[PDB]
Design a binder for this molecule. Structure first.
Ligand code: MG
Ligand code: MG
Lengths: 279, 279
């Protein structure tokens, strides 16, 4: 298999991951398992998903990485949560359609694919995050904010006033915040203000791993900044230095380290959320 | 050549124009000519370009047309205007990078390609239109607003409060408004208010032509609405029913009918703008 970045001809100077890197980091079938919720939540609260509206991430040599949200990271936790009785709605900063890394889609997965087909409209036709925020109050029917990973989470979210406002709402109102991989870079949106996530501990994708990708062609160049180091400056603790599929719970902040953590995170989120609403 | 829509694998259920339609509607070299401005403008006023931030246009069967701004329509008028002494700056509604129809890029054009390479950063790193608007006043160093065509102009622009505000500024302050092909759909942003473009006459891409494309595979499905009919309801006059490369001037509203009109529009814009600033 080739280690050369694969041209994405839709865009100028843009590349998908190399054939070789895809063979290491994607599969046609996910690890979804353990969706066993005999007494689901029956209320109306939903997961608010903050997703990526831009597919193209600039790298350090000017080439664009053709990325987006990671479909395993976003669909597996949502599958468990939906099974536990929590439907979801999607928002992007612009209001433009969610942009997925389709090259990581588990295309042969007999459970995840039907789930995607059923719900793809929600991703393709999201709300504008600012509109959701304008309406938020103590009674809002959102049980959690979910920020899926994929390198698309690095675009816009870390700088977004709307994301900051949403996260402040969730914490003030004792709701869940769920994220994994590069998703927690969205927490950087809080850098300008009083920072309600100061002191919190998380799993996240290690910055060190992002420096080993470009050589095998998973990205066409290096990242121009590293979210982990920045989150540490923002007073957050990253508990892992490796990729093991680890998940962590700190109060109502539930996180995972990588795509490998996606199934475990769905389980932890479902368990925690059911308990909180029960009842 | 095949008339089958060509899959754009970056996105789910999305298609580029068919091989056959590309052979009819694109060329490796543009018709750029007549750039002869012996006494250019020397001031600081620029063209403000309102461009497309979304590549994917939903068609009536659920397939996405992989479109964007048309590079001939956007680069040819800008080439003439730059030669006449008017530099440009780019804004999108979201602030995300301009999305071009790269499949229409005149890749062998020895004049246009170097111009694109020189200025591609301006398209890739645009301002957010709302930020530009917040700052607008009587002394703003914008000589014109340019809305290039391509089917990407149909996305967001026709519904945009920021676009409405920009156009109201231009008209109130007796600046130029330049557009061609589907670009004038952006004028639909004025539908909610007092409509300062009521009564104005334009060239535009004929709605009838958009109903003949999908059969030859230029788009993967039909449009769900037609901008010409809507602009007529909004009190504007469309003077052409065909595609001939026609351009029109009504006061300071300068328009063209199609990519064929792009060179002529650059010339008309340059001539009109030089005269207005002279001096
Ligand atoms: Mg190498
Ligand atoms: Mg047919």
């Amino acid at each position: 298999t080739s280690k050369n970045p694969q041209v994405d001809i839709a865009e100028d100077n843009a590349f998908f991951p190399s054939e070789y890197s895809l063979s290491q980091y994607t599969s046609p079938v996910s690890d979804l398992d353990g969706v066993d919720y005999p007494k689901p939540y029956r209320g109306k609260h939903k997961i608010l998903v903050i997703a990526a509206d831009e597919r193209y991430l600039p790298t350090d040599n000017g080439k664009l990485f053709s990325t987006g949200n990671h479909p395993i990271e976003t669909l597996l936790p949502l599958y468990h949560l939906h099974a536990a009785g929590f439907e979801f709605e999607v928002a992007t900063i612009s209001g433009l359609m969610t942009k997925f890394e389709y090259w990581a889609m588990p295309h042969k997965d007999e459970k995840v694919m039907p789930f995607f087909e059923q719900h793809k409209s929600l991703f393709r036709n999201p709300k504008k995050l600012a509109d959701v925020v304008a309406s938020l109050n103590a009674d809002s029917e959102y049980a959690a904010i979910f920020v899926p990973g994929g390198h698309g989470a690095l675009i816009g979210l870390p700088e977004s006033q709307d994301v900051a406002a949403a996260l402040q709402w969730a914490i003030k109102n004792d709701r869940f915040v769920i994220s994994l991989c590069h998703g927690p870079a969205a927490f950087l949106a809080l850098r300008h203000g009083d920072n309600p996530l100061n002191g919190y501990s998380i799993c996240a994708f290690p910055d060190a791993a992002d420096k080993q990708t470009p050589e095998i062609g998973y990205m066409p160049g290096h990242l121009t900044w590293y979210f982990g180091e920045e989150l540490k400056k923002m007073g957050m603790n990253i508990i892992n230095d490796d990729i093991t599929g680890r998940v962590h719970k700190d109060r109502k902040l539930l996180t995972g380290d990588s795509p490998f953590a996606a199934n475990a995170l769905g389980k932890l989120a479902a368990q925690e959320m059911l308990a909180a609403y029960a009842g």
